[PDB]
RNA sequence: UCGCCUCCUAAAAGGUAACGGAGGCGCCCAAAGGUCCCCUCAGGCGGGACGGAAAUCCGCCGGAGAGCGCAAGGGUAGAAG
RNA sequence: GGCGACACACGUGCUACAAUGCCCACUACAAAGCGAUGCCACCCGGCAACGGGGAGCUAAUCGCAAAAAGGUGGGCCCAGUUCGGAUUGGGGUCUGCAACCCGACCCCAUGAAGCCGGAAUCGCUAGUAAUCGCGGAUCAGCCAUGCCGCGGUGAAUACG
């Protein structure tokens, strides 16, 4: 144990969207772009797009020209 | 790529629409990719001509801008000696 | 880049105009 | 005793929730997350030690605990290596350090993974344990990117006093284990 | 700065550094920094952290990019899996999609020459 | 073919022949030696990035089928490993 | 439907591998030809292709066209890179009864191979080779990087 391992200091770390604690590790504080426990990407879900379906839009895009209708 | 036209064959549609009231039979041919996938009568089979014979293509959503004959290859290839 | 469709030079070579080569003024 | 947010989060939230979900009658029947052991299959160091040492201090930085080299049990001419030969690092961490690692794992590293739709829910042992693969090791906050030489990963084993892989499925779910539904 | 899925480009003009992302190219590049209101000719070397945050927040959102849209593109080709069209078969055989000449050329999809001889 | 080692022939002590049935040896190790202190294998089934029938890791089950420098026999984890 | 097929082989080419270079902006200087069952100024919508308008022109009158290489200014700084543009996804436009097989452009995103070529092999002796753009025929459109022409800048060397 003694005289080999790195030590573990108190808590402080910077998130790209807000805050984070714990840290310990080796560094006093570090930077993190993609935040975690906050919200983006599978953390409350932020549906960026939806990936268009052809049954919906393309039936109403090709079908927007309802000249072929009936 | 049309935009204000976006056409289907009148004769393909005539045969397709007057055989669409309250149900039908999948026995329906054609002779023109020229058309378009047509919503409604999705649960249908359209025997498309590939130059030689009438290939029964099946519609199950998914398809739209792809008219017909894309679902009817005209060549065979299959292999080159191997 | 005489074959790149995103240059005034490629647009010349192709002949056509556009965003990367406006029809003057 | 330090503190650790995840540690508390276990006691004053995750702990009573389990007694409600499963209705344990004893304070010990409840699943207790203990022992998390990191392992790196290091064939890369088939014939290199300065590539092994760089992987050592790298690991020591993310866990705060020196790893130990593992050696090949036998000999496989089919893919080199003999009896000796440092092929693989491994560090065991339980208590305090296990929690400090588990926090930065769930609450920094895991989301920093490319795309990442969530941990596999079938990746459960059958005796209440979990394991998960990792590609890049730069996803750990203590890794500075511009100080690496190779993208070497690691296997992670999380051992738990649960019986079934359901009670653990629950225990980790509460602690913050994204499971891709 | 770890903008999207990448971080690489240091001292090399943000309008150019942006390009180094699958989803940015050149048009979305200057479009993103004029809409975020940042000088294009900057160092990219981690300048004003605020500009970097705003840039990241706008770019990474808005439109799909990096590994996510690669998945969508691959899925759009997976569209013509099922009982798909003619265009799908061209993705199947590994041949050019747009009906071009395959008697010669088409090496960018066929790959290097194999030579049969006879 | 000629000396030495192991198994069988060998008829439940020892011993026992044939130009009977099968294999080894003419070395090696300053640790593979002394002692003190620790530790338990092979396999099978799950779990796990690159990693597959086998690489390391976790988890159960596994009395010894592993290992014991090299033939074979005997022995051996309550150790000789 | 096919002439457009593709495991491959050859010819004629086009575009490049970059800094005597690329991108952006500004600003000059041609000839030879073609057009009122068309060329379409100038406005208007549009990032743009293009669409709405709509003047002039049976045309040394009006239009196609601003020639481009050049010059000025600025930016990249030599790394498959602001070189290179293939391939592929998506979104559009125009002709056309219709563009899946097989049309040309436009815009967004991808950005491949190629860092200058083995044995071999070609052209050119003065406005020439090299390099740069322009026009016409056929033509609804166009797979033209082809062919027939036009001019811009403008070498090297020939002992024998
Ligand atoms: Mg073809
Ligand atoms: Mg006896
Ligand atoms: Mg006996
Ligand atoms: Mg006896
Ligand atoms: Mg000893
Ligand atoms: Mg022909
Ligand atoms: Mg290469
Ligand atoms: Mg170079
Ligand atoms: Mg002569």
UniProtKB/Swiss-Prot annotation, chain A:
Keywords: Metal-binding, Ribonucleoprotein, Ribosomal protein, RNA-binding, rRNA-binding, Zinc
Co-factor binding details: Binds 1 zinc ion per subunit.
Entries under Pfam families matching the protein: Ribosomal_L31
InterPro entries: Ribosomal_bL28/bL31-like_sf, Ribosomal_bL31, Ribosomal_bL31_A, Ribosomal_bL31_sf
GO cellular component entries: ribonucleoprotein complex; ribosome
A single GO molecular function term of this UniProt record: metal ion binding
Cofactor annotation: Zn(2+)
Binding site for Zn(2+): 15, 17, 35, 38
Any Gene Ontology biological process: translation
Sections of the chain in a coiled coil: none
NCBIfam families: L31, PRK00019.1, PRK00528.1
Family: Belongs to the bacterial ribosomal protein bL31 family. Type A subfamily.
Quaternary data: Part of the 50S ribosomal subunit.
HAMAP family per the UniProt record, alphabetical: Ribosomal_bL31_1
Functional summary from the UniProt entry: Binds the 23S rRNA.
Name by which UniProt lists this protein: Large ribosomal subunit protein bL31
Curated annotation (Swiss-Prot), chain B:
Keyword Ribonucleoprotein in record: yes
Matching Pfam families: Ribosomal_S19
UniProt key word Lyase: no
One example of a Gene Ontology biological process annotation: translation
Molecular functions (GO terms): rRNA binding; structural constituent of ribosome
Keyword annotations: Ribonucleoprotein, Ribosomal protein, RNA-binding, rRNA-binding
A GO cellular component annotation in the UniProt record: cytoplasm
Quaternary structure annotation from Swiss-Prot or TrEMBL: Part of the 30S ribosomal subunit. Forms a loose dimer with protein S13.
Task performed by this protein: Located at the top of the head of the 30S subunit, extending towards the 50S subunit, which it may contact in the 70S complex. Contacts several RNA helices of the 16S rRNA.
Homology family: Belongs to the universal ribosomal protein uS19 family.
Protein name: Small ribosomal subunit protein uS19
Naturally occurring in which organism (per UniProt): Thermus thermophilus (strain ATCC 27634 / DSM 579 / HB8)
Gene: rpsS
UniProtKB/Swiss-Prot annotation, chain C:
GO MF entries: rRNA binding
Disulfide linkage: none
Highest rank taxon of the organism: Bacteria
InterPro entries tied to this protein: Ribosomal_bTHX (IPR031414), Ribosomal_bTHX/bTHXc/bTHXm (IPR030826)
Pfam families the UniProt entry points to: Thx
Region (Disordered): 1-25
Gene Ontology CC entries for this record: ribonucleoprotein complex; ribosome
Biased composition (Basic residues): 1-12
Alphabetized UniProt keyword annotations: Ribonucleoprotein, Ribosomal protein, RNA-binding, rRNA-binding
Function description: Binds at the top of the head of the 30S subunit. It stabilizes a number of different RNA elements and thus is important for subunit structure.
Family the UniProt entry places it in: Belongs to the bacterial ribosomal protein bTHX family.
The protein's assembly and partners: Part of the 30S ribosomal subunit.
The protein's name: Small ribosomal subunit protein bTHX
Provenance organism: Thermus thermophilus (strain ATCC 27634 / DSM 579 / HB8)
From Swiss-Prot, chain D:
Molecular function terms from GO: rRNA binding; structural constituent of ribosome; tRNA binding
SUPFAM superfamilies with a match to the protein in the record: RL5-like
Pfam families (UniProt xref): Ribosomal_L5, Ribosomal_L5_C
One GO process term, biological-process aspect: translation
Record carries keyword Lipid biosynthesis: no
Source domain of life: Bacteria
A GO cellular-component term linked to this record: ribosome
Keywords: Ribonucleoprotein, Ribosomal protein, RNA-binding, rRNA-binding, tRNA-binding
Similarity remark: Belongs to the universal ribosomal protein uL5 family.
NCBIfam families, per the entry: PRK00010.1
Function of the protein: This is one of the proteins that bind and probably mediate the attachment of the 5S RNA into the large ribosomal subunit, where it forms part of the central protuberance. In the 70S ribosome it contacts protein S13 of the 30S subunit (forming bridge B1b) connecting the head of the 30S subunit to the top of the 50S subunit. The bridge itself contacts the P site tRNA and is implicated in movement during ribosome translocation.
Subunit composition and interactions: Part of the 50S ribosomal subunit; part of the 5S rRNA/uL5/uL18/bL25 (TL7) subcomplex; has also been isolated as a complex with 5S rRNA, bL25 (TL7) and DNA binding protein II. Forms a bridge to the 30S subunit in the 70S ribosome, contacting protein uS13; this bridge is straddled by the 5S rRNA. Contacts the P site tRNA.
Protein name: Large ribosomal subunit protein uL5
Origin species: Thermus thermophilus (strain ATCC 27634 / DSM 579 / HB8)
Lineage: Bacteria, Thermotogati, Deinococcota, Deinococci, Thermales
């Amino acid at each position: 144990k003694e005289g080999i391992h790195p030590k573990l200091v108190p808590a402080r770390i910077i998130c790209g969207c807000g805050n984070v604690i714990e840290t310990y590790s080796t560094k006093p504080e570090i930077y993190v772009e993609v935040c975690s426990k906050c919200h983006p990407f599978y953390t409350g879900q932020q549906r960026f797009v939806d990936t268009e379906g052809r049954v919906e839009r393309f039936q109403r895009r090709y079908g927007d020209s309802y000249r072929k209708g009936r | 790529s049309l935009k204000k036209g976006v056409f289907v064959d009148d004769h393909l549609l005539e045969k397709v629409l007057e055989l669409n009231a309250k149900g039908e039979k999948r026995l329906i041919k054609t002779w023109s990719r020229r058309s378009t996938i047509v919503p409604e009568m999705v649960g249908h089979t359209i025997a498309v001509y590939n130059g030689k014979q009438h290939v029964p293509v099946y519609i199950t959503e998914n398809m739209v801008g792809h008219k017909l004959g894309e679902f009817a290859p005209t060549r065979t290839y299959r292999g080159h000696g191997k | 880049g005489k074959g790149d469709r995103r240059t005034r030079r490629g647009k010349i070579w192709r002949g056509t105009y556009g965003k990367y080569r406006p029809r003057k003024k | 005793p330090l503190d650790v947010a995840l540690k508390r989060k276990y006691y004053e939230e995750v702990r009573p929730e389990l007694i409600r979900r499963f209705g344990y009658q004893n304070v010990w029947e409840v699943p207790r997350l203990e022992k998390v052991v990191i392992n790196q299959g290091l064939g890369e160091a088939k014939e290199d030690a300065r590539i092994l040492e760089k992987a050592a201090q790298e690991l020591a930085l993310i866990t705060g605990q020196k790893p130990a080299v593992t050696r090949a049990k036998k000999s496989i001419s089919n893919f080199k290596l003999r009896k000796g030969m440092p092929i693989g690092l491994r560090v065991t961490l339980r208590r305090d350090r296990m929690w400090i690692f588990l926090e930065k794992l769930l609450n920094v590293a895991l989301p920093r993974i490319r795309d990442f739709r969530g941990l596999n829910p079938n990746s459960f042992d059958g005796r209440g344990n979990y394991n998960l693969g990792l590609r890049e090791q730069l996803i750990f906050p203590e890794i500075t990117y511009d100080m690496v030489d190779a993208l070497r990963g690691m296997d992670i084993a999380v051992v738990t006093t649960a019986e079934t892989d359901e009670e653990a499925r629950a225990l980790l779910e509460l602690l913050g284990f994204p499971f891709r539904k | 700065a770890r903008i999207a899925g990448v971080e690489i480009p240091r001292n090399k003009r943000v309008d150019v550094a942006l390009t180094y992302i699958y989803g940015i190219g050149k048009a979305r590049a200057k479009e993103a920094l004029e809409k975020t209101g940042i000088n294009p000719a900057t160092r990219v070397k981690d300048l004003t952290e605020a500009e970097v945050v705003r840039l990241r927040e706008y770019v990474e959102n808005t439109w799909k990019l990096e590994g996510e849209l690669r998945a969508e593109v691959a899925a759009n080709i997976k569209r013509l899996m099922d009982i798909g069209c003619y265009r799908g078969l061209r993705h199947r055989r590994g041949l050019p999609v747009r009906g071009q000449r395959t008697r010669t050329n088409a090496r960018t999809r066929k790959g290097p020459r194999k030579t049969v001889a006879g």
